[model samples]
Target chain A: XRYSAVYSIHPSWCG
Target chain B: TEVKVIQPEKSVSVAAGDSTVLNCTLTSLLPVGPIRWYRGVSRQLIYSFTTEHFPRVTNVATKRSNLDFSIRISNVTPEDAGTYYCVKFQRGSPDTEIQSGGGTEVYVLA
Candidate 1:
């Protein structure tokens, strides 16, 4: 597996 | 090697028709040119890297040495509610989003 990047928001919100 | 971006504010809330600031910080000392801000799942809204591109958007850290790429959005609407990303790009061989902040969620109250 390769080292991939992850993007996310803090204090997760519900959609 | 890795460059990390720190978004101090986890989220920001503002009433519709008001203004709010989104903050971001670059931990690297390297010159990565100008950072950019993108919003939403589609990542449609892009700003910075130019002057007068969007009147509502203002760069908080106009000086490059500060390594801060915070921005202010004026007259925010409910439509502006979404996660905003702070992205750094590589200048050569097809610009790419090298690294980005965790993200800052903006909420606009009606």
Candidate 2:
């Protein structure tokens, strides 16, 4: 699978 | 083979209508270029790789060293409250970007 991520302020993502 | 953050250690908070700058550093000479700055809300990409948005999110990389890498946000507001990240593509084919995993969480007050 591809490894990808996004920058976000939501604790669910940024933490 | 990868990259990571070298400063801040965590997140930051700023008052509305103030200027704030976020910094992100990568491992020394990791075969990367054309760096990116992103603003995301709800975990989705907002400002990214677009010249039109360059003024809001500026890249200060100097190509000579990593010490010059950073993102700047001026006159921030509550609506600007979100996560900001720096990214650089390091591989090919199944191209993978370094440390797109997480970034600095900037909180702008109302």
Candidate 3:
């Protein structure tokens, strides 16, 4: 996933 | 106003006993603030200027005047294998995260 303006903890599995 | 946090490297790999660097940069048309490094899915605060408790974590930049907010993680272990994010907060508002990089995934080799 790309960087988002709205911040959220990008889950580890999603990496 | 658009603030962008850039992670130069998408991933970094290092031996278990070695050290690795995670690069982060802030590009903005407006004012910028302090940045931070977070670890894993829990988003544990790994390093920041004001309250970084980990001695193994060091800021890559020599002078704070620059926009580079990169960090080095030393003596990493298998447990340290995960993604890291560089985050920018709203000036004077520590709790407000204005922008974040596409995380740098870390791989620790045994």
Candidate 4:
């Protein structure tokens, strides 16, 4: 399986 | 990005109710050091410190790819809006450091 680069805001900022 | 901070990701991003600008300013409240701006494009080496203190503004395009960028604040205050940046990251590189946006001297606009 190829693990692609996933971009996301750190959960700390996720409301 | 201050005034109407918008991040160019895979969706439509806009800040309503105020004039929108495309620049991010960083400052420190603890007087840690000079403030700086960091632009991050996906799969790219984070573009290190672009602006020093005294408010050096730049414009970044979010049309091609996803990018996660932010502004650092030094000598923060109760009014200091916590390190605010775009909520989404674009998937491509943007027009590196182009002065197309503006930031206000937010002393306590949080």
Better structure of 2 and 4 per TM-score = 2
Task: Determine the C-alpha RMSD for candidate 1 after optimal superposition of all C-alphas.
Answer: 11.2
Please provide, for model 3 over B1-110, each residue's C-alpha lDDT reduced to its tens digit, 9 standing for 90 to 100.
48788998889988988877788766642453456678864678776532222232342312222455666666778987889988887666446777889999999989
CA lDDT, every model vs. true structure:
0.62, 0.50, 0.63, 0.26
Q: Per-residue lDDT tens digits of candidate 2, residues B64-94?
A: 3333245556677677776766665555665
Question: What's the fnat for candidate 3, on a 0 to 1 scale?
Answer: 0.00
Please compute DockQ, using alpha carbons, for every candidate against the native two-chain complex.
0.03, 0.04, 0.04, 0.03
Q: After superposition, how far is residue B74 of candidate 3 from its true place, in Å?
A: 1.1
What is the DockQ score, from 0 to 1, of model 2?
0.04
**How does model 1 score on DockQ?**
0.03
**Docking outcome class, model 2:** incorrect
Of the candidates shown, which would achieve the greatest lDDT relative to the real structure? 3
lDDT by residue (B1-110, candidate 4, tens digit) is 32222333222123222222223322211222212222232322212231122222333122211222343233334533222223222222442232212323332332
Off by over 4 Å in 2: A1-15, B7-9, B41-65, B91-95
Misplaced by over 4 Å in model 3 are A1-15, B28-32, B50-65
Best to worst by lDDT, what's the order? 3, 1, 2, 4
Distance (Å) between predicted and true CA of B104, model 2?
1.3
- Writing each residue's lDDT as its tens digit, candidate 1 over B1-110 gives 67777888889999988888788777763544446777865876455542112332342323443555567777887878899887777665666667888889998999
Best by TM-score: 1
> Residue B29, candidate 4: how far off, in angstroms?
30
Residue B52 deviation, candidate 2, in Å? 21
Query: Where does model 3 sit among the CAPRI classes?
Result: incorrect
